[PDB]
Design a binder for these strands. Sequence first.
RNA 1: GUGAACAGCCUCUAGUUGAUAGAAUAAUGUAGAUAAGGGAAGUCGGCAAAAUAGAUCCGUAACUUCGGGAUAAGGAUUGGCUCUAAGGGUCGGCGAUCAACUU
RNA 2: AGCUUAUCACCCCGGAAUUGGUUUAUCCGGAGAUGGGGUCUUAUGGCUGGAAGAGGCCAGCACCUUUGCUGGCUCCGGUGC
RNA 3: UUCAAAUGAGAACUUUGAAGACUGAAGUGGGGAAAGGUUCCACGUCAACAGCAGUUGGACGUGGGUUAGUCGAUCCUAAGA
Lengths: 151, 50, 49, 130, 77, 101
Amino acid sequence: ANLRTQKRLAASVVGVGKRKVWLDPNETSEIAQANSRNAIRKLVKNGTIVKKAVTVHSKSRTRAHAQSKREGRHSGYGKRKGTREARLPSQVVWIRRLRVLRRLLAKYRDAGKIDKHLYHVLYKESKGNAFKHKRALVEHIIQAKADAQRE
Amino acid sequence: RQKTMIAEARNRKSLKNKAIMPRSKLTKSFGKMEEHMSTLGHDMSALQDK
Amino acid sequence: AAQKSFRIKQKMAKAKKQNRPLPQWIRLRTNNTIRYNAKRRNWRRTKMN
Amino acid sequence: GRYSVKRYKTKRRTRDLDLIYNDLSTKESVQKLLNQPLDETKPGLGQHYCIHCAKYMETAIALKTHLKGKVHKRRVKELRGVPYTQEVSDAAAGYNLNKFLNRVQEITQSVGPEKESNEALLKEHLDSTL
Amino acid sequence: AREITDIKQFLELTRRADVKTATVKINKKLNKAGKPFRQTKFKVRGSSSLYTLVINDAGKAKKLIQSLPPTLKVNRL
Amino acid sequence: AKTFTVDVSSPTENGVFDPASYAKYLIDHIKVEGAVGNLGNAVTVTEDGTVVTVVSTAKFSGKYLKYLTKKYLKKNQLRDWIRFVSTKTNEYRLAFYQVTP
RNA sequence: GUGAACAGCCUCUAGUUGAUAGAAUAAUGUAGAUAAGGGAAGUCGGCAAAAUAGAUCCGUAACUUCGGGAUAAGGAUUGGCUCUAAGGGUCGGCGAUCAACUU
RNA sequence: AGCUUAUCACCCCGGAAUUGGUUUAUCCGGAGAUGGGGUCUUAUGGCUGGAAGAGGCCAGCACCUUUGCUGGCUCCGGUGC
RNA sequence: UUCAAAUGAGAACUUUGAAGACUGAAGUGGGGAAAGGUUCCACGUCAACAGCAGUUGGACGUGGGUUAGUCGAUCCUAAGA
Ligand SMILES: [Zn+2]
């Protein structure tokens, strides 16, 4: 016999590929009688043709390795194979840093912790460097305000 | 017997290829479960009726 | 192709209607010289332009 | 195969930790090799010579980066105990036991802390100059 | 397809004289997250569009069913 | 709280299953905040003979219950003939496969 | 998934399992691979092969159309596991809360 | 399909050096900034209608069918060079 | 590449199942343009062809099959004729 058409039709009906669908070799004449998708559906429901659930692709190992990376492993020079820039652009780092410094100064000026003139000079100093992060900027602000009230 | 179970499941599984068929859809004989449950130590007088 | 012109499709239809063997009731005729179709065509052997 | 064949040739043979033990044992030996007059052929022109890893570096900073490394610590953790001579190899088989045991107690008493103090002086000398 | 809020315009649509068919749909829904209740959708088939009215309260819904005209065909579920 | 309800009539009648051993397995192998031995006022496993019942205030799920029950069936060599299924929400039951003569 | 990466290696979905077969394992070949000690004595000719190779750090000459040469050259390292520090956002008149991989 | 929603752009008030606002990238302002309020394009997203009645996932039950019919679920989120 | 069964006079090569592998999303996948023109699909089916074989086939014999106000041509003009 030749159940090629039947395998094709069963795949097209169930909505999978032919690599999945399964024909019990005992009901060969009953399958060969079928030449229609309605008959193939009958054979699907009665239990003559089934679906063959998916071949697995587990991610336990990937999740474990990722967890170790979060914990700070597998990162040394023997694992690094691209440049520091290709791994993380200095442009991206500088963008983050400068957005942060601009946002902080905006919030301080709007709250009233600082005036617009000191805001203006700090804006351009943070556009340049000499403010490496939030901590340094806050400390410089404190020094400025303290010497101002001292004057 | 534990080693025998492992050796049996090694042949039975073949899991990295083709995703073992579900038992929902398959059908088994009667006589097979007779032997299985007799080996387990049950009796089939309640199943023979059926 | 698949966006043919009707001229090409008409020629194709003629070719399909020609693509046959010879009928058997012509073998049985008085003074029959014809034994096969010598103008037979197949898509793979000869192209019809 | 090729890796072992082309690393561990007798041409490219290194300096047999027994001798490094015997060299780090005494004061004069370590001071001689720290001094090491200017030789035109040696890599670092003499100076910058690690004794544990019997190796000439080019410069002081190359010595620093060598010492801040696991290749150095491999050797220092290999050189702490006794040096495994033929005495050990035959005392294991039942041959000149008393010589081996005298050598062992000799190292445990005399030569051990001698070399340890020499290593400590070496380390603080190098860390202070570098 | 179009939604309606008012009731007067739904009655006008039922009496528009180009409507032949309507249908009532019942759905079980949860309010906010909380309690089951019975939403009703009264759809009427115009020529160009399908107009629909959403009624949450079944009491007003069945009175709407009563006030529907009699010649209009209706389909339940 | 949350209630889950297993039925064991089918196998127990034909004599392959005892609900008391199943509950004795569950009550010890159920985990809370780590390992065995923390079912303090949180969980209550109780049988009737035809129906086993679980009541949990802690983290517990039908998939966890199915996992435990399948483990018990594999222990007693019943995985290849019986399946744990849901008939209604949080109402499960054991059922034989489609064995025909 | 590894990794800078649509590279190379493995896998999921989908597809294929097509290319005349069987038995032995001689030489000569075709495609590869290893070899003591010596290391270009080979050969027209170091042809071919080998060696080097990624990333971090140090360091980098003559000459120069001053822009380059330059990855010049030459050197120290690279695993795994347990930790430390630093690098942010949202709300509250310093705290509560949340989150990523980079060093 | 209905309602709503945006960067740029524009309008009203007001009149700026102790010059200010501001992009990752430095440009804008008496030819009227910052600030306050408002208008517009509706690509794009959100809600509703379409539309759950569909589809999907399960459980069954007729077993004599070359179509046999019922029941449940289909929810709420999070994150990024 | 292999194992059993089925079919058949006959199976290393066909069908199903059971295994083992491969392409490895810049595919041995899913769709299209030019070109081809029924090679698509089904039923029978082995004389010749498929550099072995053949129960199989893009072969042989006979049929079926391509549904548009919204996809295209059609219309516009481009270099040009
Ligand atoms: Zn050393």
